[PDB]
Symmetry: C2
Subunit: 316 residues, 2 copies
Amino acid sequence: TDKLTSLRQYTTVVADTGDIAAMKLYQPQDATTNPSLILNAAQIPEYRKLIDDAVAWAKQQSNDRAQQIVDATDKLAVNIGLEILKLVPGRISTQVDARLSYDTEASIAKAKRLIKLYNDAGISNDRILIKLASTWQGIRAAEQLEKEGINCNLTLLFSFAQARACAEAGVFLISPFVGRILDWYKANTDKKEYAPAEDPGVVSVSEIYQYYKEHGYETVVMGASFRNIGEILELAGCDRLTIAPTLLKELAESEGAIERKLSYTGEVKARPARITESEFLWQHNQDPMAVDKLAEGIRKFAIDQEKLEKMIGDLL
Amino acid sequence: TDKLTSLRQYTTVVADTGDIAAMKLYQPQDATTNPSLILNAAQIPEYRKLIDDAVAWAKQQSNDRAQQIVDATDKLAVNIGLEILKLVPGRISTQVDARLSYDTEASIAKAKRLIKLYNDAGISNDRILIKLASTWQGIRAAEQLEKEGINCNLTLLFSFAQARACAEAGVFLISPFVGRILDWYKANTDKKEYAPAEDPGVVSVSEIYQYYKEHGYETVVMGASFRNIGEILELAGCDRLTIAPTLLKELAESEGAIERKLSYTGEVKARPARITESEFLWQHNQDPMAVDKLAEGIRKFAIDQEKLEKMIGDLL
């Protein structure tokens, strides 16, 4: 049989898309969306109903243009999540406005607003992950949210400083990126081709996995962002992997059994003192890839948010 | 006559070097050093005496190897500053350990330690600038130091966020970079050749100068880091410009009068509310050049500090 089935022996497969068609085809446990995937899904003709409901809902909440734009964009993202939850038994990830990524208080408020919208639609917190960029401010936001029963997905995770800080904050889940790390190394070193085991994204996730398991951290490790199935197969055994439909299709179409690659068998090791903000900043900025790609990811997600607001603004 | 003389009609010329030979030759008003220039100057044979005095001094302060390394490196930097002050009537800039760039309290303590060493050598605070990287933490350190009578030189200034935050903190001087901005644009865009007026470093400083003067800010604007004399001449009129001996030589050797380029003639405009930390972080990270080059500059200055410690450690 096939590599997707074989991978599922070792790893919980999660679908990276806002498209319900993929949920029906691959039957993933969880799904992840982000502002870019929301923007994309808002282009699907059968999703027109959801956009219209969002706008109609926003118009019931206030007579203010600016607030309606915000309400409508939020309710759209939640509506898409609601449709996905009908077809997946686990979590939906919904990302907060990336423009809030360096503001802890605002991120906490936006997360709670998204959670309220889900709760009012009849969905409990154990079905939701709020996605936040893994800046110091987002990690601090997540730490508080978890204490209030709101589970988070810490995204745009590139540096070891980020990984360490997330574990220490007790966040429910992290999405350490793989493919964007590969992108950076191709652009910034002479080495353009990598064996799967040498892929710097694969190395990143493998080392984060080891660090979490060896210190008994319960934060779910979920690899995200993939350029090819070689990366995915090298991470077989990762707690979860969120994978785009294109690569789910390649896995399902690929014959052959695979082996588990990521395991930890040893003792639980003593934890260090918590990393301080200053230490975090020093160590994150030691990593030029991480410096670039965290900042870039946030810029790109904010641009897509702005495009979503323009679309919604055109319909008011 | 010559372009250096002509430039001096409009701008206070400062020498960017730890080499006393340049102070004798060009007779600058101020001088700037940095950890890289200290490392370089420590290679000058006639500076052996200064290294030996630093080590001898460090050995008088403690019997501890680690502390002697720190005391000796600090005293060397100050000794080089002391020799420069014999030949320049204005300021010396001396940079704190770049490893402290994201730690406000440690940066304040290091600045005061450097100030003490100068004061004990008979030099008053009005002859010194403590250089700090213009991270939020360094700007906050500077704000406090200025209130305590310690004047600062905010370096590695790339983004408007940094410029704005520095002005609002009331720092004595900023060093907005020119040449490293050009470097980033040549590396990351297809455009490899720039007319002086189009040079992005020149544009950066020009826009910072306009902002400072139009809001009545009294922080000294000092362009730093140059790749060519075209950059320098486009900034004629900048309060100060710190220039490396190689480019001082080219100016002195170039015949012809130059015009003033940077002036502000209009009304003082109302200031905004102070930029918050979250707004600063957002706006700094909107600037991919600034994101990369601030983090990089700090890494490079920390590496040179380490190399300095290795040399000193070899002599204990």
